[PDB]
């Protein structure tokens, strides 16, 4: 994991749906995986302590460790949820607080998705936890993470491990990149207001009689770059301005549009290493269906998933894996 | 038309691929339409004069007039071409210059992809016209036009019909938008060198140690709106930067990922008529097997024509229809 | 008041000097004026407290109310400090926490100036004031502000009314503009580490080669506006790359052209009113010598009062009065 | 050389005002020069014709080479000029162009001011002569320069020494830097006309009011590096937007104002040879008064030159050397 956009939507159709693009450096093994009722999921992966799940959910993830590990996903009663890096500024503790337990960052959203209803569910849960510095998601150190969650009534969060504790941000915008902290961007958000979809007026200097070259002058301003601050302020703005979904499919049509703003190419990032950092899929989710809809760098076809489709007291991880080609229709030979 | 930007590139295994978007208000009747040898395509739209084409082509386009415009398109000797909105520059003529005839700027794609190889080919082909203020009943008069070619051997040029007269580029950097006219942008990307891949390098002011929030600082000062001088400076950029590709399907995809820079969501920007300007499809062709590829806004699954794969010979128009349905694959029930 | 910029700086001299502009839409009665030893700066206008002040300062500001209220200065001892605006962020109490006095926000700098000596006196006097929703009758209302201060160590702090109570930035980078708050502005660096004075490097587009129109081209990507937060990128980044000044006079020389990229001219920003807000004037003053340096929206020729020429138990105001004329040098007849 | 930006005003007081910044690496010998009349100017420095000027003039130029080379000035009928760099576009002959005279570049501005009234004087002026590519002693080598003119009416002209001849440009308006050509910096105004004093209005995202930090939100997507396309933007936006000057001395101010958001600290540019680049002086001069102003990078207080107050009919070149000296004015010791 390496930088991601995500926001949530509501539709005229009363549904919110949630989406995200993931970025990385090379392609690992994830699928999409559905986690039944009462699996187990462990807190720490160095303790052989499990929490039965109450709940069932579907999303992208991980089976390379002992517990799935989710990146985002929907459970069976609406609650939709991703992890997104937050490099330099997540904070986690060595030891618990007195009352809590500890639980690695990495599986934050598996333990919420499976046990959770409400944004406010979360917030209580998080209080009976303190996230710790364990060491070796065998991927190393505890990844520097923050969450944000939404339910079915398309309220938002964002939960933030701070040098000075967890920060609960409520009712928020329902869009979240990468560091700074929430509300720094929220705030960097004022910065911008300038930015409109509508063509500024024509003017004259002397003589000279000035237009724009062409539309979407009215965007100036906007950086394009692929800085966290950047496809923040690109998603949150084109969340304001896209037109409202009008149901479902049109939701994840919409969604895909705006963070096709921020998705990125492989090659045009590098890390202070001289790795290609790019956007691996993205996928989206809707909090009334429970289904899971995903896309990939080498495939522009999506995918779905649906959660309430398959036996949710199953005792087995269901799990679908990427299809890496593209899905290209041919109309004749 | 209204805005659009394209580019091409080339593969590893020696292809040439070209890629546009189209952006508009309405979304109106078009589809892919291949044009078989010897349909005879009009050089005006009010007069009966008949060019026949030698070659065949496919690609985006109307049929609601005399003969198919072609939006963009490859033929089947490999030249690829796009006519793209250049609106406060494009200048035409009332009547032809000695020894040429008129020609319709719709038409202009058409006529040049029906009977033209190289790019040396087009530029000859043209001093034998002259673009004239004609006008057609779809959208209710001439619209300012520039246009791009790129043949099978990669080479591009950009041909702009200026207030001075017709102004050629030749071998450019193979990627084009709307105004203005292609000498300014190439001179704009100037500017633009400092854009990279990189991370610049931490820094401290007094006691503090600055550092990125994440990755991508390497690309401050690359704007982000949808005006054509910034879509040609993302275009072109990530076109440096982004990878080579393999093969062709490799190459589709790269020029799909890169135009997505660029793709204009609903809403995102409206005109002064207070109308909705947005990327109705996206197309790829390839010089080498002449496949012609799309998306559209409302479906993201691409589809694909092969223009060798029909009678060339064909008394007909051939046609293939959008398909404006999100096109999702359910692994299960759903 | 309605904006303004502001920075320190340390010479080789072992000498602190910090400078201000002040941005305003419309310039009220302000001089240059010496307070004297135990003069008096009441705290409140509503109430009739007059503290006793220990030091003598000089700096720029109004007699129009009760005590004499300065926008910033120096006092004898080396302690140097402004109010600057803070719109939206700061946040007053109707009436004092328990023990504390009510203090309004525009006497804060007055009272500093008289009785501290360095950053932490600065501190913990605040600590016995809570700052008041009172109105003052040159402005109407409790103007929203945000403070700094910088002691003759060359320390700087940052004192911002927040929603939450005062909040204190120690040993801070030494710049302050506007809104929003400072860690917010301390973060939004991190964004800009990119821009420095060196050249990118030259990059090929395939055939083309790319270098720069000229020279400047490291800082692609620095704002070029006027609202709060371009100004701090603009005064921190050019305060990192501009020669350290090797003496006093330097030092004036050196603060003025950084604040140079963001002198704003009449007409160039429109508040929601359409009044003009502009540079009025812009100071400098240095800790070790207690000099007090200003020149003018209408007069670049800079001006300086000593504080220590003068009588500091003189029983009235000394005052400067504004030249308001371009102070030409003839150099023969004109 | 290496930058200035330029522009001229107009007062409602009727009179004309040019000015421009100069930037380079370390001040040469420079002062402020007043040719008078018949003092005659060479064409080129490897041969000795010399032109004799009609008109007396006033500019800030060098003595070093054998007929003083003004970088700009103002002449005894209001002509105003100044001569900016041109890097990578200036294209000069080996050879004059069939009858024409030879001139070498560093003496444009100085055989124009010398000889010429209008915009019109100047256009016929020069395409009497070809710019030669021969090389000077105070730089060591040929300079690429174009040149800009004003005349006593207002009227400015930009002439650029293009790969394709000599590019003339009448009517505009009135601002310049260094490259690239004037039509790219014309047509590059287009694409920022939104950048204005006026705030944009509030808006909202969901529940959330947003409103700008404090003023000048108007100027969103100006640019602030010191770039000449940059420095294009900022003098021409700032030109037309700061309030028109009521008279001469206004209309100085003013222009020092404008010229402030393009004044370059040292140390903020540094060239490839890691040699600083900083503005060195600022100038002014007014068509009707023939008054000559400037302020040094060492020195904001302003002076000035009467051109009148002397003898136009001298001997000897008159000058007056620059005071590197912050002239503070003591308000008490």
């Given amino acids: 994991m390496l930088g991601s956009s995500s926001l949530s939507i509501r539709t005229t159709d009363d549904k919110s749906l949630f989406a995200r693009t993931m970025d990385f ?38 089976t390379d460790i002992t517990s799935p590990v989710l990146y985002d996903g929907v459970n069976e009663k609406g609650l939709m949820g991703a992890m997104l890096y937050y490099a330099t500024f997540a904070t986690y503790a060595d ?12 599986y934050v959203i598996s333990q919420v998705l499976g046990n959770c209803v409400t944004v406010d569910d979360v917030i209580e849960k998080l209080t009976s936890y303190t996230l710790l510095n364990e060491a070796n998601i065998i991927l190393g150190f505890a990844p520097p993470l923050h969450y944000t969650f939404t339910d079915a009534s ?24 990468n560091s700074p902290g929430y509300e720094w961007h929220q705030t960097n958000l004022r910065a911008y207001i300038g930015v409109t979809p509508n063509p500024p007026q024509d003017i004259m200097m002397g003589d000279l009689d000035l237009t724009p070259f062409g539309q979407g002058a009215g965007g100036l301003g906007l950086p394009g770059d692929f800085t966290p ?7 949150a703005y084109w969340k304001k301005y896209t037109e409202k979904a009008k149901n479902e499919t049109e939701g994840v049509t919409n969604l ?9 190419p492989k090659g045009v990032v590098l890390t202070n290493e001289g790795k290609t950092d ?3 899929y993205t996928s989206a989710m809707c909090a009334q269906s429970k289904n899971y809809y995903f896309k990939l760098y080498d495939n522009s076809r999506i995918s779905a998933v649906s959660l309430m489709a398959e036996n949710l007291n199953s005792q087995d991880l269901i799990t679908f894996e990427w299809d890496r080609k593209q899905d290209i229709k041919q109309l004749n030979q």
Same sequence: chains 1, 4.
Avoid: Q
């Fill in 95 to 106: 030891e618990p607080k007195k009352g809590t337990r500890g639980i690695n960052p990495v």
């Fill in 278 to 280: 790019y956007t691996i």
């Fill in 25 to 62: 450096t090379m392609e690992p093994d994830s699928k999409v995986i559905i986690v039944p009722r009462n699996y187990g999921i462990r807190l720490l992966e160095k303790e052989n302590v499990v929490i039965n799940n109450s709940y069932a959910f579907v999303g992208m993830g991980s």
């Fill in 154 to 177: 398309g309220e938002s969060i964002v939960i933030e491990p701070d040098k000075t504790g967890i920060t609960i941000h409520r009712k928020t915008i329902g869009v979240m990149t």
């Fill in 256 to 264: 895909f549009h705006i963070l096709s703003s921020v998705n990125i």
């Fill in 229 to 235: 601050s950047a496809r923040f302020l690109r998603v």
